[PDB]
Amino acid sequence: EFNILLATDSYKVTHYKQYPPNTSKVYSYFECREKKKYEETVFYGLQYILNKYLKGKVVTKEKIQEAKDVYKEHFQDDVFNEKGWNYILEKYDGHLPIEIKAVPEGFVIPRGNVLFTVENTDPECYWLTNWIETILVQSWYPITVATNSREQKKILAKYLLETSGNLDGLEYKLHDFGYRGVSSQETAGIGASAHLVNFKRTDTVAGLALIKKYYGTKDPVPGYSVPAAEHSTITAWGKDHEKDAFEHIVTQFSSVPVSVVSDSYDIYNACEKIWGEDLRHLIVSRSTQAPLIIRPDSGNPLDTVLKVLEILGKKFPVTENSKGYKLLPPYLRVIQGDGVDINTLQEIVEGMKQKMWSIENIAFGSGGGLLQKLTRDLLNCSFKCSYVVTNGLGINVFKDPVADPNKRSKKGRLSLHRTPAGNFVTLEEGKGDLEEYGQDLLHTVFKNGKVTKSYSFDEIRKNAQLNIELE
Amino acid sequence: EFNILLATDSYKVTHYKQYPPNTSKVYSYFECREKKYEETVFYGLQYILNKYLKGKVVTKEKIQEAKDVYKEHFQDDVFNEKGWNYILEKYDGHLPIEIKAVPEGFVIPRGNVLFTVENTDPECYWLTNWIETILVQSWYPITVATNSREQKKILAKYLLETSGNLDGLEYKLHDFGYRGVSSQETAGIGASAHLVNFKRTDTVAGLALIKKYYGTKDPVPGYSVPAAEHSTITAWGKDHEKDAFEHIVTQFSSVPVSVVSDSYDIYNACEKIWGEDLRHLIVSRSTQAPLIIRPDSGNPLDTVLKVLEILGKKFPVTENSKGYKLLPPYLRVIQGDGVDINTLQEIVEGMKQKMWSIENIAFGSGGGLLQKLTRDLLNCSFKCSYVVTNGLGINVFKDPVADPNKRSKKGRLSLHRTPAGNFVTLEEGKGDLEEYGQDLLHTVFKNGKVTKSYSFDEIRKNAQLNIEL
Ligand SMILES: O=C(/C=C/c1cccnc1)NCCCCC1CCN(C(=O)c2ccccc2)CC1
Ligand SMILES: O=C(/C=C/c1cccnc1)NCCCCC1CCN(C(=O)c2ccccc2)CC1
Known part of the structure; x- marks a missing residue:
C-alpha cells in the first residue's frame, strides 16, 4: 500500500x-x-x-x-x-x-x-x-504531454485548413502508439489521458480507466481505436506469402477501417504491386466508412510518405480538391507511425504541402515522441x-x-x-x-x-x- | 485493480x-x-x-x-x-x-x-x-541500469587516475530524480535500476520495490544524507543566508550535511560566508561528517572549477600521491544541476585538466538519470x-x-x-x-x-x- x-x-x-x-x-x-x-x-x-x-x-x-x-x-x-x-x-x-x-x-x-x-x-x-x-x-508530466500534444494539433490544424479548407477529422489525426515505449503502467495511463485532452484516438488502453475513475465523460469512453496489423501478423505467413496475409486481413475486416503495416520486406513493392495490382480489387470495393489504411514503418519519414503517396497516386484514381491539392479515393488512406515527434510532424506536413498532397490523405501515430521523449x-x-x-x-x-x-x-x-x-x-x-x-x-x-x-x-x-x- | x-x-x-x-x-x-x-x-x-x-x-x-x-x-x-x-x-x-x-x-x-x-x-x-x-516496458529498467553503469565507468576511470583507487565510487552518483519522472511507479522502477550500480538515492520509492521483488542481505539497498533545499535557506530572508547556513550545520554537526549555496550568489557564499564568516564551524568537523557545498546553477563545469578554486584558497589544500589537489576531509562538493552522461564526462575531464582530484566531488542527477531516456x-x-x-x-x-x-x-x-x-x-x-x-x-x-x-x-x-x- x-x-x-x-x-x-x-x-x-x-x-x-x-x-x-x-x-x-x-x-x-x-x-x-x-x-x-x-x-x-x-x-x-x-x-x-x-x-x-x-x-x-x-x-x-x-x-x-x-x-x-x-x-x-x-x-x-x-x-x-x-x-x-x-x-x-x-x-x-x-x-x-x-x-x-x-x-x-x-x-x-x-x-x-x-x-x-x-x-x-x-x-x-x-x-x-x-x-x-x-x-x-510530477504534475509536470501530464501538463507536458497535454501541452506538446496540443502544439502538434495546432500544426495539423494549420496544414489541414490550408490544404482542405476545413478541420474535419482533426481530432483523429494524431493517434497514441506509446504504450510499450513509456517507463511504467502508471505512466502509460497518465500520459494517454493527457493526449486525449486534445485527440480521440489511442491504443494506450490504460488511459481510459484513468479518465473514467478520476475525471469522467458523458460518453462511454474518451478514446477510440481501429483494427490494425502488426509485423507479426504479416510475417507469420512466411516471406513468400505477404499477399496472402494482406488478403486475409482486409477480408476479415472488410466492413470496418483497417490499417495494414506494409513495410515488412519492401514497402514500395507492397504499395505498387501488392496493393496496387494484385489486391486492388479488394481495395476499390471498400466503403468510405471502412477504408484501407496503408502503414509504412521505416525509412526517412518524409521521403517515405512522399514516395508512398507518389506510388498510390499512380495506381488509384486521384482527385484534386477545391484548394488544388491531391486527394486519394475515400477508401484509401495512409498512416505514418514511425519516428513522429513534433519536429518531424512539421517536416512531413510541410513536405506534403510542397508536393501538393492534401493532409486529408494522412494521419500520424506517435509513441515515444508523444509519451516518453519529454522532461x-x-x-x-x-x-x-x-x-x-x-x-x-x-x-x-x-x-x-x-x-x-x-x-x-x-x-x-x-x-x-x-x-x-x-x-x-x-x-x-x-x-x-x-x-x-x-x-x-x-x-x-x-x-x-x-x-x-x-x-x-x-x-x-x-x-x-x-x-x-x-x- | x-x-x-x-x-x-x-x-x-x-x-x-x-x-x-x-x-x-x-x-x-x-x-x-x-x-x-x-x-x-x-x-x-x-x-x-x-x-x-x-x-x-x-x-x-x-x-x-x-x-x-x-x-x-x-x-x-x-x-x-x-x-x-x-x-x-x-x-x-x-x-x-x-x-x-x-x-x-x-x-x-x-x-x-x-x-x-x-x-x-x-x-x-x-x-x-x-x-x-x-x-x-522492461526497456526502461534496462536502459536506466545501463546508462547508470556507463556513468560509473566514467567516474571509475577518473577517480582511479586522480586518486589511485576506487574508494567511494558507489557513492559518487546520487539519484535526485523523484520529482522529475513521469509517475510514482516509474520512480520506484528507475531508482531500483540505478541502485544496481550505486548506493545513494533520494528516490525513496526504489527501496520498497527492491525489498518486495528482489531482496538484499542488508536492511536497505540505498542510502541518503541530510541536505538543504532552496526553501530552507530562502525562508530565512535574503539578508540572513549566513544565519540559515549556521543553523543548518549546527543542527547537523555530527553527520554529513549538504547545503545548497547558490540561492543568491554561490561565489559569495563560498568565499565570504563559508570561507570567512562560518569557517570556524567547518574546520572543526569530522571526516565522517563533512560539510558538502552544493552549487546548483550556471555552467556546470565552469561553476565547479570556480567553486573549487575559491575553496582551495580559503581552506588548507593538500596534494595526494598522484599529484592532484585535495580539499580537507571535512569539506566536499556536490554538483547536482545539469548532470547527464555527457556533462559528467565534461566535468571530470575539466577537473583533471585543472589538477583537482575526483575525490573532492560527487554528482547528483535527476531528469538525466531517470527521465531523459527512450x-x-x-x-x-x-x-x-x-x-x-x-x-x-x-x-x-x-x-x-x-x-x-x-x-x-x-x-x-x-x-x-x-x-x-x-x-x-x-x-x-x-x-x-x-x-x-x-x-x-x-x-x-x-x-x-x-x-x-x-x-x-x-x-x-x-x-x-x-x-x-
Ligand atoms: O495502425 C494502427 C496502430 C498501430 C500501432 C498501435 C500501437 C502500437 N504500435 C503501432 N492503427 C490504425 C489507425 C488508422 C486510423 C485511420 C488513419 C487515416 N484516417 C484519416 O486520416 C482520417 C480520415 C478522415 C477523417 C479523419 C481522419 C482514417 C483513420
Ligand atoms: O544534496 C543532496 C540532495 C539534494 C537533492 C535531493 C533530491 C532532489 N533534489 C536535490 N544530498 C547530499 C549528498 C552528499 C553526499 C556527499 C557527496 C560528497 N562526498 C563524496 O564525494 C565522497 C567522499 C568520499 C567517499 C565517497 C564519496 C561525500 C558524500
Missing part, C-alpha cells in the same frame, strides 16, 4: 530541522517558468494526484512506524519528524492540513504564471508544504517557496542565482488574473488584495484532506480547445 | 483474427537491437513477472470488464472473449506461457537475445504477442521469429528494404558462449546442433509460475565493472 511518508525526496525528511525557528507558515507555488517555443501550457493532471495520493486518511500508526524503520536504515541515523506526523494523525484523523488553490484544469496559460499554490493550514505543519513538493511536481525542463515545471510567516510576520522570499536569472522565483503571496486586454498576469507580494485586477482565477481544489472542486474530462477538453477551433 | 486484458496495445485485441489459420505456436524474442552503449545490463523482468504476469490473472469479472470497454473503444465487437475464457476454465486463469531469459544483472553486448516468449497450449497462439506491450536509445524491441502452422515450423522475420537496422532474427534462438568466452546468439534452431555448448538462457516463467529468480545482491554482482572485478 502507498505510504505518503515514503513518497518524498529523502532529504525532505530532514527539513523540519532547517527552517527558521518560530515559522508558522510556508507557502509555495508551481509555475512553468519562463526562459529567455512552448509559449503556453495546458494545466492538466493535478486532480489525479489529489484523489489517488493526497485525500482522506493518508497517515496511520503503521505508516508512521514503517517510515521510521526505513529512514533509520536509509540515513543510518534517527532523523525523522515522528512527532509532526503523530500530530496530523491525532488532531486531524490522518488528513493533511494543507490548502491547494489551482487554475481550472484544461486552462491554457502562458509561461511564467502561477498555476497552483500550496500552504499549511495549521502552524504545527509548516514543514508539510514542501514535503509534498515531490509528488505534486520536466521542457516547460521548466517548478515548485518554489514564495512566502513564510516567522514570529508572526510574513516575509516574501525567493531565490535569484547570480549566474542564472532564468531561475529567479516569484516573491510573496500570489494570484492569477485577467488583464484588461484579456491575457493573464500573476500578481506578486500579495498585490491581488488591492483588487485592481478582478477576481483571482485560482480556486481552492484541496483543503484539509478533502477535494473541494473537481472538473470532468469534458470540461477540461472545452478549456483546452484551439483558438482556430473556437473560430 | 490491474487487468491484463486491458494492458495491451488496442490493436492487439484484433490480432487473433489475423494470424494464419491453424497456427499452434507463436515464438517471439527481445533484444537491444544493434545499430555508444555497446553493452546493456539486463534488469527488471522479474518485477514484471511477479507484479503483473504470475498467478491467477484472469477472472470472469476481468473478462466482462474488458469486453465492455472494447465494445465502446472499437465501436464494435472484436474482443476474443472465447480465448480468454479458455484460459480461465482450463488453467484457473494462469497464463500458458513459457519465458526464457538471461540472468538479471548480466552485461551483454547489443544484438543478442535477452529473453524469449512462447505459448505452451496451441489454443493460446495469440497470447505470446498480447503480452508484448507489458514485457517491452526505448530508441538501446533499440529495445520484441519480434516474432518462429511460428508453427498446420504442424510445420517456419522461421519468420522482418527485413525492411529502407532500413537494414530493423531486420529481425530468424527462427528459434539460443544464447551461447563462444570459444573466446564471449556471447553469441544462434538463430534457426542451430543451438540444437550442440556445436556451441549449453543455452545460457534459463526458464524464468512457465504456466503462471516464476521458475527462476535472483536477489538484488546477485544482480549487483553480475553488473560489476571489469575494473572492479
